[PDB]
UniProtKB/Swiss-Prot annotation, chain B:
Binding partners and assembly: Homohexamer. Forms a ring-shaped particle of 12.5 nm diameter, that displays 6-fold radial symmetry. Part of a ternary complex containing STX5A, NSFL1C and VCP. NSFL1C forms a homotrimer that binds to one end of a VCP homohexamer. The complex binds to membranes enriched in phosphatidylethanolamine-containing lipids and promotes Golgi membrane fusion. Binds to a heterodimer of NPLOC4 and UFD1, binding to this heterodimer inhibits Golgi-membrane fusion. Interaction with VCIP135 leads to dissociation of the complex via ATP hydrolysis by VCP.
Protein localization: Cytoplasm, Cytosol; Endoplasmic reticulum; Nucleus; Cytoplasm, Stress granule
Modified residues (Phosphothreonine): T148
Name of the protein: Transitional endoplasmic reticulum ATPase
Location of this fragment in the whole protein: 289 to 749 of 806
Annotated Gene Ontology cellular component terms: ATPase complex; azurophil granule lumen; ciliary basal body; cytoplasm; cytoplasmic stress granule; cytosol; Derlin-1 retrotranslocation complex; endoplasmic reticulum
Disease: Inclusion body myopathy with early-onset Paget disease with or without frontotemporal dementia 1: An autosomal dominant disease characterized by disabling muscle weakness clinically resembling to limb girdle muscular dystrophy, osteolytic bone lesions consistent with Paget disease, and premature frontotemporal dementia. Clinical features show incomplete penetrance. Frontotemporal dementia and/or amyotrophic lateral sclerosis 6: A neurodegenerative disorder characterized by frontotemporal dementia and/or amyotrophic lateral sclerosis in affected individuals. There is high intrafamilial variation. Frontotemporal dementia (FTD) is characterized by frontal and temporal lobe atrophy associated with neuronal loss, gliosis, and dementia. Patients exhibit progressive changes in social, behavioral, and/or language function.
Effect of K27 to L/Q/R: Abolishes methylation by VCPKMT
Organism of origin: Homo sapiens
Effect on the protein of changing E26A: Does not affect methylation by VCPKMT
């Protein structure tokens, strides 16, 4: 159905391109059974289909080695057809093939360098003498001989485009050489194959543009007008302009490009004149495609716009696309980042009827993108693209290209010892040795970050799950929360239940909430966005909710994402209690958050985590399941947790064996984690002081403390204090007890 | 142009996009455009003495036209080309489909009934999409890469009713294209309990459009306002989702603070245009989620801050009064803090109906637990009646999170068994009573007394 | 040979005075590439369609001479966020810059450098891979770094024996 246009349906004519052992530039060899199926005799001229509107003619031959589904081909014909090994091409007999009256050929600029003899005499004259080789325009064939082999490209064929080389046919090398860069650019033209992901979107695009031009008879028979307008919208980097390049490179219709601001001109009425000239030029050549890049630049809302020229341009576009005179077989495409900025009148059926959404690829999509990108790059055997696809979470396709470029740059960096910037040339052995390996991709993955999250990126102190002491059940629960919906979605589908996507940490100050957030940010396989509470608020009216909406939109784009509110009680407070706060701007912010976490829009894979010191003042609607589903209480550590905390802080520090951490944990009762860390830091400071005094004494004598001992810990302990008092403990335990009594039973057992 | 119209008489002058050439003079900041508007007024005055020339103009925005141009003697007669009703949509379909190769099974009256706000261009979009689907059905036999098509396939080409059903699933009015959100599939049996509220909503949405005749006979104008108020997690947004999916009336879902903008007058303009695009697509349901975000007690904004909230709520009350009774626009507001709502929006004539979504009862909790687990394999030994008994004060969200905790425990157990089997290589067909017991141990009431 | 196009965009960000324009000047003097300087506010003009034309002519002149480096100093003035700005000329100049950096016709050998004090004001579409390949952070120098800066500055001046640049680096 939808993907039916993309499938090749295994037609018999299409054949696998295969290396030809002994065929020349102008001949091809096929198996006997296939010719018997194709009724193609030996020595017959055929026409070969290719990608990017490329065709070539070759002499069919019989080869025993060639398979039924395969065609043996020279590299020359593949270059002419822009087809790699293994691509399927249709083969058909050339109709009314004629001998060439005259053929003009132009050699490549790089090859003719260093050729003392005449290019025509050394190469053209013997090769084309009794060659009887069919050729077509735009075909490049390599010719042996001389100090360097010279590639020759037949720019002009008479009769165009199919001709046979004959001895009486005139051959001449007169003319400017073909530029090597031009041939390379012709080689690197994107087609529908270079687009990765979005198979349905590509199918819809092909249905809009390719199908009417190929088969207008279908639409005439069904008697409808095929859609004429396409709007491609999506976040930056997903590939809208790449699809535009693909359409421009491999369509038969006329392609006219309009860049948004380019229309504007200083003279009054000149912008409308530019648009009218563009559409008139398209209509002159009948089947045409107009691509308006950055449409939102020149099509804003007429109500919103304050400038007369801009509104007149929008109205000009509206009348051009739909009016008394309708377009005669002209397709109009536009790509915009902000689809809502477009005037509503354009988004009607007459003008932009089909809106195709190019979205963020899923894991398989970005694997497909990676295969497309790296098919050209040199790769080792150790590189595994499934891993690189699974790791890159929110990448859109431009970010995957950035990852490839970073890996290649690191691979080149590894060879700076051999390579020299001062030297004008590099050894060929190094060039052979240079290839992108898996370690380069691992380093690139370490550096890589989505472009969408560039603004909301913060350096994180690099905590690991082993640095946190105690809280084992909370650790396992956070790991399950992040990992289960991502790594095991089929299980949830089997049980047919959506995951819970919210956690609230509340407890005494210094007990390990921000530390858990740091551990999640460093380790887990999900993007992290960290938010200070009051950072979103702004003095301007309606701007605070705009910031909230934008941050939740960023979280949705980069899903799976973790959204962390460091001090939730600053931004989510009970409504109606603020006398000032502007015009209830705090309440409006709370309402926007309430709508974003649970509203009409379908749930995506975004986890909201919040930390608070005072959970009582937080709005009751925020704590409702579906928003912050699970409330986790991070209590003051008990004795086992205190032992774990002291061991975790001291794992890097060299401490003497005589220090008994169990006794420290026993004596310190009610100490928060921060208090134990402060004890360790004070002991460290006393040791540093002792080292300084010993060094000063030694310096004085001229003109210690290898590890922390028990006396330092004794001094640090006499300086120590309890940070959280009993009133605070009581109020947190009171909130917990209110929840526990709300439960209605400590234990629940089904009747037997 | 006017001279050539005068030379050849009788004649018609058509001015397309009138608002483009004739904006308000006081709004315009360019000398040339003011001169052009004055020239248009003068040329209308001259047209008054012209005998056989009549000018006709078309505008998407009737308001942007200069009010002087709407004065008597200049564009005296204004014709409002409104959206068609059911009979009009059927007529448009019959006219469009005269050339198409329709099959015998298709009947256009059903298609006309299905569409609600389509303006005649959306109907053409629907026809084109159906034809495209019909062509897609034939693309297995014929390929795009092929150069010629068999005549048998060409004779096979015809639009069936499956194609119009597909198009109707895909279709959407152009006006609503600006404001559309993906809404999860929710159906009426997904909601547990609240049967009276379900029936009331179905009545209030269906009766005025289906049978206006009874209401006009009895001289009662139907109520066009509903307010949903209750504890958090009881099913207001859920009812809105169900109405969006199931009911046959256009749905506009909007967050509260999304209308507001820092620029002067933008918030009022947004309110006006949203109510406008609600009118253009009647019958339409306009749902204000978190209503207390927009409508708060008057005078607080003026006291502290810019005070644009008061102007926004005044604009909303004005637009609520402006819409006519015959027009089918039903306004639903959801809130869990009804006390801070401005009483002016509860005044009779605006949001007349107040529905209280209560904290679910025992039978309600049984219905909720049954509805949540309909798609999940659950052991027969699991007793939902006992769960409803024990959770006296739980709301719907709490019961849902109990079931989700049971599901998560099941997933955890399956993963442990899988890891055990994999480790020895180098379980849980359904949720049991143990998972529900542990989930209930983790349960807690969301709403205090 | 490795098979990738080399990076073609740079953004230098840091607090004022760190040396972004100094690095731009060093790259300009030290390279055999045609260097074109663009100042942020120098582009824009009152007339409609002239600022976009200035950008187009700048990039066209860079295209004609290859290889080329374009340095847009104070990019934050010329490229604010299109969501936030109200004026149309700013949004259209941002769109023109976007289409010039990465569009249907891609710059073959032009490398665009830009220095900005506040990077977050830049339009998020410009910070994408294609436009500005990566962002280089010129930060406040450390003790050794500021000692190196002192040695570079003081080599030209005449210095008596008693001067100790080590201590001068320590005090600042
Ligand atoms: N599907 C894809 N497959 C392969 N490469 C892709 C794909 N999508 C994007 N790219 C890569 O991203 C770049 C093309 O991005 P493109 O110019 O299409 O973005 P865009 O949608 O126009 O963005 P912007 O919003 O900035 O206009 C190229 O480097 C291309 O290799
Ligand atoms: N369980 C723990 N294991 C190890 N270190 C801990 C633990 N709890 C607290 N700390 C220490 O506490 C310090 C940071 O405290 P943290 O950020 O976790 O506090 P918090 O609960 O977010 O408090 P606040 O109320 O101030 O926001 C670090 O020095 C960290 O080592
Ligand atoms: N009666 C019910 N039947 C089924 N599910 C329900 C019911 N009530 C609540 N739920 C569940 O809880 C959620 C419904 O919450 P909803 O958004 O409707 O609440 P609300 O009344 O708008 O509250 P809030 O004040 O939090 O916005 C969904 O996840 C749904 O599965
Ligand atoms: N790393 C450095 N080494 C040596 N001199 C430096 C260094 N950084 C700055 N300077 C000196 O400081 C001067 C000012 O630096 P520069 O003009 O590059 O500032 P900037 O960061 O570009 O500022 P702006 O915010 O105005 O763009 C330089 O001309 C140079 O004399
Ligand atoms: Mg683009
Ligand atoms: Mg903290
Ligand atoms: Mg709700
Ligand atoms: Mg500078």
């Amino acid at each position: 159905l939808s993907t039916a246009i993309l499938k090749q349906k295994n037609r018999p004519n299409r054949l696998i391109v295969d290396e030809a052992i002994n065929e020349d530039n102008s001949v091809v060899s096929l198996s006997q059974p296939k010719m018997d199926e194709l009724q193609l005799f030996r020595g017959d001229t055929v026409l070969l289909k290719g990608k990017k509107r490329r065709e070539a003619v070759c002499i069919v031959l019989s080869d025993d080695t060639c398979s039924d589904e395969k065609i043996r081909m020279n590299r020359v014909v593949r270059n002419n057809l822009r087809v790699r090994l293994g691509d399927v091409i249709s083969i058909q007999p050339c109709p009314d093939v004629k001998y060439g009256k005259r053929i003009h050929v132009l050699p490549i600029d790089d090859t003719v360098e260093g050729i003392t003899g005449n290019l025509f005499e050394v190469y053209l004259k013997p090769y084309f003498l009794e060659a009887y080789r069919p050729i077509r325009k735009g075909d490049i064939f390599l010719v042996r001989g001389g100090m360097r082999a010279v590639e020759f490209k037949v720019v002009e064929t008479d009769p165009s485009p199919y001709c046979i080389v004959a001895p009486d046919t005139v051959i001449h090398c007169e003319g400017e050489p073909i530029k090597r860069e031009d041939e390379e650019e012709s080689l690197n033209e994107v087609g529908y194959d270079d687009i990765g992901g979005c198979r349905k979107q590509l199918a819809q695009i092909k249905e809009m543009v390719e199908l009417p031009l190929r088969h207008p008879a279908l639409f005439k028979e069904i008697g409808v007008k095929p859609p004429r307008g396409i709007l491609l919208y999506g976040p930056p980097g997903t590939g809208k302009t790449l699809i535009a390049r693909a359409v421009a490179n491999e369509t038969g219709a006329f392609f006219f490009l309009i860049n948004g601001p380019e229309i504007m001109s200083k003279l009054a009425g000149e912008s409308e004149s530019n648009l009218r000239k563009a559409f008139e030029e398209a209509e002159k050549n009948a089947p045409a495609i107009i691509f308006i890049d950055e449409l939102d630049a020149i099509a804003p809302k007429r109500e919103k716009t304050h400038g007369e020229v801009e509104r007149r341009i929008v109205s000009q576009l509206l009348t051009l696309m739909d009016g008394l005179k309708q377009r005669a077989h002209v397709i109009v495409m536009a790509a915009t980042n902000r689809p809502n900025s477009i005037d509503p009148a354009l988004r009607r059926f007459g003008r932009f009827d089909r809106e195709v959404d190019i979205g963020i690829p899923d894991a398989t999509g970005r694997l497909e993108i990676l295969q497309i990108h790296t098919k050209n790059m040199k790769l080792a055997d150790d590189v595994d693209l499934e891993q690189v696809a699974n790791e890159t979470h929110g990448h859109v396709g431009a970010d995957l290209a950035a990852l490839c470029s970073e890996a290649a740059l690191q691979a080149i960096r590894k060879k700076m010892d051999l390579i020299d910037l001062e030297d004008e040339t590099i050894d060929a052995e190094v060039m052979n040795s240079l290839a992108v390996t898996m370690d380069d991709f691992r380093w690139a993955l370490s550096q890589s970050n989505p472009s969408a999250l560039r603004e909301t990126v913060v350096e994180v102190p690099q905590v690991t799950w082993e640095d946190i002491g105690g809280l084992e059940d909370v650790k396992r629960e956070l790991q399950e929360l992040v990992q289960y919906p991502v790594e095991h979605p089929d299980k949830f589908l089997k049980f047919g239940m959506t995951p819970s996507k919210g956690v609230l940490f509340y407890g005494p100050p210094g007990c390990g909430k921000t530390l858990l957030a740091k551990a999640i940010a460093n380790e887990c396989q999900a993007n992290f966005i960290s938010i200070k509470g009051p950072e979103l608020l702004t003095m301007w009216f309606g701007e605070s909710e705009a910031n909230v909406r934008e941050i939740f939109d960023k979280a949705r784009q980069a899903a799976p994402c973790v959204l962390f509110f460091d001090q939730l009680d600053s931004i989510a407070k009970a409504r109606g209690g603020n006398i000032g706060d502007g015009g209830g701007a705090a309440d409006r912010v709370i309402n926007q958050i309430l709508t974003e976490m649970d509203g009409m829009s379908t749930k995506k894979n975004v986890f909201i985590i919040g930390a608070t010191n005072r959970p009582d003042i937080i709005d009751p609607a925020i704590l409702r399941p579906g928003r912050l589903d699970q409330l986790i209480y991070i209590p003051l550590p008990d004795e086992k947790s205190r032992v774990a905390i002291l061991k975790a802080n001291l794992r890097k520090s060299p401490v003497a064996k005589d220090v008994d951490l169990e006794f420290l944990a026993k004596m310190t009762n009610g100490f928060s984690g921060a208090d134990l860390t402060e004890i360790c830091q004070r002991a460290c400071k006393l040791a540093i002081r002792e080292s300084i005094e010993s060094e000063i004494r030694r310096e004085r004598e001229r003109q210690p403390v290898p590890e922390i001992r028990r006396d330092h810990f004794e001094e640090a302990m006499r300086f120590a204090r309890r940070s959280v008092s009993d009133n605070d403990i009581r109020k947190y335990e009171m909130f917990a007890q209110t929840l526990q009594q709300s439960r209605g039973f400590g234990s629940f057992r089904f009747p037997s």
